[PDB]
Design a protein around this nucleic acid. Structure first.
Ligand SMILES: [Mg+2]
Ligand SMILES: [Zn+2]
Length: 1432
RNA sequence: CUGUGCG
């Protein structure tokens, strides 16, 4: 009892003297009996955490446990009926209510579940209380430990230990609590997953035994190699007999180039009433196909004014809310109208007008007549109201002048408050003349009437004239795309559709002003009209604005992409005369898919890849052509198909035989142009419906769909599950009257037996292998932890997976999102099967070395022109089964491993009984359609299922079935099954023929490489080889592996994981990489965007994209940044790089090269000093007296000291003045040491600290997703907002800082040819007016730090003189001439991180772990035109 | 309450 007295003394001594805690302390002190003492101690601890949480976040403790309605009625607010919710904390302030329910959870799954439950409850309460008109912002305080402010750490730990011992003693003495509650509290108080199932009671009933018996019955896994070989031989003989007699149909055909071309040409012969289109006629039709295309190729041909200045000024001041958002709008319209009148009287201007309407603030088109009527009404109203009191002359003109002056004065006062003066907006106050009201009312304009043609019932210009060879069309599309994307930024305010007020985006083309007019705001598809002041209503269309990002500034990039592709097939003799047309066709295709980004066009372009793969092959699936045809609707889609057909027929002509690799590369890049179209969904609901029908139809064909199963599985449902498990294994083949039924899900007992026996006897291996309410009142009593488990799952319920889609190029992929507990449960299976496949070889899914081995093997196979068989597998997800994996694992033969296999079987059976939740949107759409059909002819299978369930009451919510694996959930298990099944299939093929096959598989993809024997059998025995291929297909089918119709047999090209290899030439997916860099723009800090673009372009250069195109892409990214008017500092992107900058160097080296380019002889002296310094630190000295004596002192003074220490010529006074503007000098930009911040953020992220922060910031962003165009407009909006944080936490605009810089005349800007800005800041002015000089950083110091970091990371060669390349003389410029290149790969870590904390310019040491490219393929000419950097 | 920016 000594410990009891010690604990009582400790709690009496070290408890805070809170009056709330005094009652509980008095209750605790009086306690004698261990049971009530335990209970009171638990209450005291719970009260401690509750009070600490309430006070920490500023809330009042709810000791009375009053409901929300009771508190509201007590505090004077009436509320309607509310759900029973008791908030732990509550506080009212003004119109803001805070609820602060707090909980403590030691487990991660329990923590996540409780946080989500509390968040849902608070959302429900907020939705209910919204009618009360009281704001309620949820606040959840989850803690992973008991530590808090009331009790110190060691006292809290000792109290917890003694109280837990007390509860153990009470349980073993009187057993007051149940076993369930006792175990729950012990697990919640004691503070890997494989042994986590040991603490759960096993309630596996006879259902699990019956499932195991089903997966064991009829399966023989003890067969010897001889018996397996005999069975395989007999199976093959029967297959040969039945394939020869025709009882089994073949699934492959020999590749016929003419027949393939004819099938492609007649892919859509029902509305395309031709097969050979004239290319000139195609150009004529393309330049007039659609209103956008008509505008792109038509003859639209023809000093800032005061209107623009005033419009920008009033657009800025309208955000400050000087203020009733109706009167300031009228004043702003009048001011802009006065500015326009001033411009027209001074120099006869016409910009900003669209006939009788003018462009006011907030992008609004405002009618002149309505403006002047409103102005006269307002002026007269205030005249008749004001003069009712006194006797003075109103003088309407002077009234308007006074209102203008007051509004302008208030706007100026608000604008200077952030630090912006009106003269930087260049507005002239002489536009407000004494003659103002009469001038604005006696103003008349007559012109065109802007309209929007919402229907499609002629074109104002000549529809032809712009040549395809030029870049005019791409520039026009760029401007139109920018206008379309900017149309989404307009704030929400309030047939010939000639309107009085609309919204407009202005863009200039060929010296003429054009307006994009729309009548609806938001990020949604709407009707747009292109209008002009000369002729109104140029055209009208129905574009979706958020699908027009990739072409915004990409005219040069796309033109150079087309030029490179054309230069590939340029020396072909047969294509010499038909070389212009190809170019035109290529150009046309690109323009089309940029003008009309359609999912159907994306699919049509994607299928060309499989067509061209089959064209250069030897055998292809007979159903390939049917799979290449998907429905086309619009005229532009059919035009695209016709253009693609013409290009293919030109390139893949029978008369053309010279350079087949180049033409294959060209056609593959044409196909991969589909990546230019955005992968984002056009219609979310339609994609959800398609995802659900793809998920449901195979389960209906199999016949097992369990509608709304309970958490406790019904006996009939269990019987049906066992029946379908047996049915999955009852697949016959080649030994029945009917024969095999292809593509039907399931496996054969015979072939499962053969595969398991082959695994068991080693035939598949190689030589290298062989009271209760009070507990609920606690803030730490866990309630969601499972305590037992049945065959169907834990007692907390079967596994839930919500179904969604992940959007890709060419459709979507099903996605199953589960609870965190379910994710941990699945991770056990995934880790086990990942390790099991890691023991074997050939799986290229998770291994990177195995993928390199596969690449080398494919290169060798193609070099020797052996047979390569590239396979995809159709419906790998839906057709595969967790029960199949269970049956495979139960028969494989490899103490505690029996227990491990039992746990794996239990988890797999849990995955068998998973419930997939139907999306709510799908159910709502089905209910609406059903109501409209029954109250008010297709009736799809899913529609029929929904209708049948609807007519009988119960609405489907969850679906359970045998025939489904989570797409990506049981992914490693599927990879292991594919590995072993393909090893068996190759073994059987070797047992049949004389050759052998080496296979590499990644979980749905495979490349099979045939040795010489099988290739020779192909040439000298086509029938035997074809029968072998059909037998491989049949064997795969017997093992639930369905070869895709897109798989190809051939010696020309080998493909695996979207990588293509041919002999001699390389196959870069240039269009894919170009589109990837054009669709990579986010709303992050601009340097992070620059780093992402640099990484993508590094990958592109590695994969073969020429360096000039990559430089153009970098220029495009900087153009995007410049549109947001973010200053281009020298640390964003280098747009003059060469091959050596990407191969030998890194991002830091590229920044060094950019800085050296900016300032020529100012980096030479620094480099001499750096060479001396690097030599001294390499000899072993000076290491400790430089990192803390120079990197800790001030800048611009340590450089001279370092130079005089090393005996080198110090930098001149001119050199030390070079600086760059760092807008993140004091704090990072508001986009809503650095290495120390990263370390803190990574340490406080796993579970112990910051877990709740990560979960909250992830759930906030979970129900918030946007497009790339939305990200770009958000970036522009943020960079135009108050994103720059000052030294004293103040918020400033970028324009504020730039105006402050302009205030000082000593500082001068200097801009590179590419827009990179660096400043010369004289040293005489750097300490007086420190308001803005603190944002500047010396350039030489940053260069020195980055150069030391790069020298340490890469070597001393970076410190040599950068001598340029000499004449060369003359080498042939063959575009398809590739060269392989490899980059040259503790004491210095401290110095590198010391450099990182001192150079706030680039992330130097954090870039190592965020994978470095290990292989480069460049162009020989570009490599030989690179610079030289040699250490001397 | 947050953009007015066509390299
Ligand atoms: Mg493949
Ligand atoms: Zn003008």
């Amino acid at each position: 009892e000594d410990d009891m007295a010690c604990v009582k003394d400790l709690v009496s001594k070290y408890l805070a003297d809170n009056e709330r805690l005094s009652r509980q302390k008095l209750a605790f002190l009086v306690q004698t009996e261990p049971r009530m003492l335990l209970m009171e101690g638990l209450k005291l601890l719970s009260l401690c955490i509750e009070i600490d949480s309430c006070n920490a976040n500023g809330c009042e403790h709810n000791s009375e446990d009053k409901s929300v309605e009771r508190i509201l009625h007590d505090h004077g607010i009436l509320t309607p009926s509310l759900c029973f919710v008791v908030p732990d904390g509550y506080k009212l302030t003004g119109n803001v209510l805070i609820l602060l329910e707090c909980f403590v959870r030691s487990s991660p799954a329990n923590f996540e579940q409780k946080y989500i439950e509390d968040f849902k409850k608070l959302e429900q309460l907020k939705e209910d209380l919204k009618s009360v008109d009281i704001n309620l912002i949820p606040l959840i305080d989850g803690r992973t430990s008991f530590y808090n402010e009331q009790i110190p750490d060691w006292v809290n730990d000792k109290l917890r230990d003694t109280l837990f011992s007390l509860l153990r003693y009470a349980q073993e003495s009187n057993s007051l609590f149940e076993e369930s509650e006792y175990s729950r509290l012990c697990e919640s108080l004691s503070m890997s997953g494989v042994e986590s199932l040991n603490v759960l009671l096993d309630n596996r009933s006879s259902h699990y035994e019956e499932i195991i018996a089903s997966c064991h019955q009829g399966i023989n896994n003890k067969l010897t190699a001889h018996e397996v070989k005999l069975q395989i031989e007999e199976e093959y003989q029967v297959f040969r007999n039945r394939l020869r007699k025709g009882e089994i149909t073949g699934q492959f055909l020999k590749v016929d180039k003419s027949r393939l071309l004819n099938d492609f040409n007649n892919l859509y012969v029902d509305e395309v009433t031709a097969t050979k289109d004239n290319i000139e006629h195609l150009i004529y039709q393309f330049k007039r196909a659609s209103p956008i295309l008509r505008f792109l190729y038509a003859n639209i041909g023809e000093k800032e004014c005061q209107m623009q200045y005033w419009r920008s000024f009033l657009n800025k001041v309208k955000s400050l809310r000087i203020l009733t958002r109706r009167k300031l709008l009228l004043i702003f319209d009048a001011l802009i109208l006065l500015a326009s009148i001033h411009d027209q009287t001074r120099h006869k201007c016409s910009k900003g007008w669209l006939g009788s309407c003018f462009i006011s603030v907030n992008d609004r088109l405002v009618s002149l007549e309505s403006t002047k009527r409103d102005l006269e009404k307002w002026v007269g109203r205030r005249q008749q109201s004001e003069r009712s009191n006194t006797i003075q002359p109103p003088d309407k003109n002077q009234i308007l002048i006074s209102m203008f002056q007051k509004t302008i004065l208030k706007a100026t006062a608000a604008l200077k408050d952030v630090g912006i003066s009106v003269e930087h907006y260049k507005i002239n106050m002489e536009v407000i003349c004494p003659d103002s009201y009469d001038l604005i009312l006696n103003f008349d304009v007559s012109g065109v009437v802007p309209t929007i043609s919402y229907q499609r019932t002629k074109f104002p210009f000549i529809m032809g004239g712009v040549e395809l060879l030029e870049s005019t069309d791409l520039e026009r599309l760029s401007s139109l795309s920018l206008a379309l994307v900017n149309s989404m930024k307009t704030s929400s305010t309030v047939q010939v559709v000639r309107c009085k007020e609309a919204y407009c985006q202005e863009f200039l083309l060929s010296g003429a002003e054009f307006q994009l007019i729309y009548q609806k705001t938001g990020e949604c598809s709407k009707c747009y009209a292109i209008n002009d002041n000369r002729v109104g209503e140029i055209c009208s269309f129905y574009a979706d604005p958020k699908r027009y990002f990739p072409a915004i500034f990409s005219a040069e990039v796309l033109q150079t992409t087309v030029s490179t592709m054309i230069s590939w097939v340029k020396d072909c003799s047969e294509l010499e005369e038909q070389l212009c047309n190809i170019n035109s066709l290529t150009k046309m295709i690109l323009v089309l898919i940029l003008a009309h980004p359609s999912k159907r066009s994306q699919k049509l372009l994607q299928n060309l890849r499989y067509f061209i793969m089959a064209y250069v092959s030897d055998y292809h699936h007979k159903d390939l052509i049917d799979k290449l045809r998907e429905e086309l609707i619009t005229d532009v889609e059919f035009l695209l198909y016709r253009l693609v057909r013409a290009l293919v027929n030109l390139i893949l002509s029978e008369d053309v035989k010279s350079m087949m690799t180049n033409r294959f590369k060209f056609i593959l890049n044409i196909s991969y142009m589909c990546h230019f179209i955005t992968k984002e969904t056009p219609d979310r609901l339609t994609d959800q419906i398609k995802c659900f029908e793809k998920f449901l139809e195979p389960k209906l064909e199999f016949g097992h769909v369990s509608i709304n199963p309970a958490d406790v599985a019904t006996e009939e449902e269990l019987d049906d599950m066992v029946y379908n498990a047996k049915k999955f294994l009852s697949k016959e083949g080649c030994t029945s009257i009917k024969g095999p039924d292809y593509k039907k899900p399931g496996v054969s007992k015979r072939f499962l037996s053969l595969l398991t026996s082959s695994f068991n006897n080693g035939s598949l291996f190689k030589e290298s292998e062989v009271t209760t309410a009070m507990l609920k009142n606690l803030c730490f009593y866990s309630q969601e932890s499972p305590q037992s488990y049945s065959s169907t799952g834990p007692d907390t319920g079967r596994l839930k997976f919500s179904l969604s889609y992940k959007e890709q190029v060419g459709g979507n992929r099903e996605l199953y999102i589960g609870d965190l507990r379910t994710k941990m449960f699945t991770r056990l299976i995934e880790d086990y099967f990942e390790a099991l496949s890691l023991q074997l070889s050939g799986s290229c899914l998770n291994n990177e070395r195995e993928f390199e081995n596969a690449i080398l093997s494919m290169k060798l196979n193609v070099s020797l022109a052996h047979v390569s068989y590239s396979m995809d597998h159709s419906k790998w997800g839906p057709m595969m089964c967790p029960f199949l994996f269970l049956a495979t694992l139960q028969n494989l033969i490899f103490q505690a491993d029996i227990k491990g296999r039992d746990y794996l079987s239990t988890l797999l059976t849990w995955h068998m009984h998973k419930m997939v939740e139907i999306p709510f949107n799908v159910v709502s759409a089905m209910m609406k359609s059903f109501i409209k059909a029954q109250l008010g002819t297709t009736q799809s299978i899913t529609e029929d299922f929904f209708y049948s369930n609807f007519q009988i009451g119960v609405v489907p919510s969850h679906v359970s079935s045998i025939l489904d694996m989570g797409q990506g959930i049981l992914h490693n298990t599927s990879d292991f099954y594919a590995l072993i099944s393909e090893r068996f299939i190759n073994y059987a093929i070797s047992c049949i023929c004389g050759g052998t096959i080496d296979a590499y598989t990644s979980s749905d993809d495979q490349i099979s490489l045939f040795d010489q024997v099988l290739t020779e059998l192909m040439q000298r025995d086509p029938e035997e080889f074809k029968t072998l291929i059909e037998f491989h297909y049949y064997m795969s089918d017997q093992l639930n592996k369905f070869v895709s119709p897109k798989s190809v047999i051939g010696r020309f090209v080998a493909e695996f994981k979207s990588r293509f290899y041919v002999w001699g030439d390389e196959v870069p997916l240039l269009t894919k990489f170009v589109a990837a860099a054009l669709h990579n723009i986010k709303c992050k800090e601009p340097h992070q965007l620059a780093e992402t673009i640099d990484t993508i372009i590094d990958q592109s250069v590695a994969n073969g994209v020429p360096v000039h195109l990559c430089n153009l892409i970098q220029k495009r990214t900087l153009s995007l940044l410049q549109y947001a008017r973010y200053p281009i500092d020298p640390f964003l992107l280098n747009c003059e790089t060469d091959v050596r900058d990407w191969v030998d160097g890194n991002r830091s080296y590229r920044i060094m090269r950019q800085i050296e380019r900016l300032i020529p002889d100012a980096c030479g002296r620094i480099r001499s000093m750096l060479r001396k310094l690097y030599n001294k630190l390499k000899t072993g000295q000076l290491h400790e007296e430089f990192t803390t004596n120079y990197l800790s002192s001030e800048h611009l003074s340590s450089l001279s000291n370092l130079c005089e220490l090393l005996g080198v010529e110090p930098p001149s006074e001119s050199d030390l003045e070079f600086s760059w503007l760092n807008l993140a000098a004091h704090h990072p930009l508001r986009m809503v040491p650095t290495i120390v911040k990263t370390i803190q953020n990574k340490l406080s992220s796993t579970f112990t600290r910051g877990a709740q922060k990560l979960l909250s910031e992830a759930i906030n962003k979970s129900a918030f997703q946007s497009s790339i165009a939305s990200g770009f407009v958000g970036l522009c909006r943020t960079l135009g907002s108050k994103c720059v944080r000052g030294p004293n936490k103040e918020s400033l605009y970028i324009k504020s800082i730039q105006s402050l810089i302009s205030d000082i005349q000593g500082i001068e800007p200097l801009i590179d040819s590419h827009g990179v800005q660096y400043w010369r800041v004289p040293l005489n002015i750097r300490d007086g007016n420190e308001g803005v000089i603190s944002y500047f950083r010396p350039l030489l110091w940053d260069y020195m730090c980055i150069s030391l970091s790069t020298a340490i990371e890469l070597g001393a060669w970076v410190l040599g003189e950068p001598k340029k390349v000499r004449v060369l003389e003359f080498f042939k410029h063959n575009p398809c001439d590739y060269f392989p290149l490899k980059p040259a790969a503790i004491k210095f870590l401290d110095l590198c991180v010391a450099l990182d904390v001192n150079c706030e310019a680039l992330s130097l040491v954090s870039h190592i772990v965020k994978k470095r490219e290990e292989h480069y393929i460049v162009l020989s000419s570009e490599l030989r035109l690179s610079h030289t950097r040699t250490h001397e």
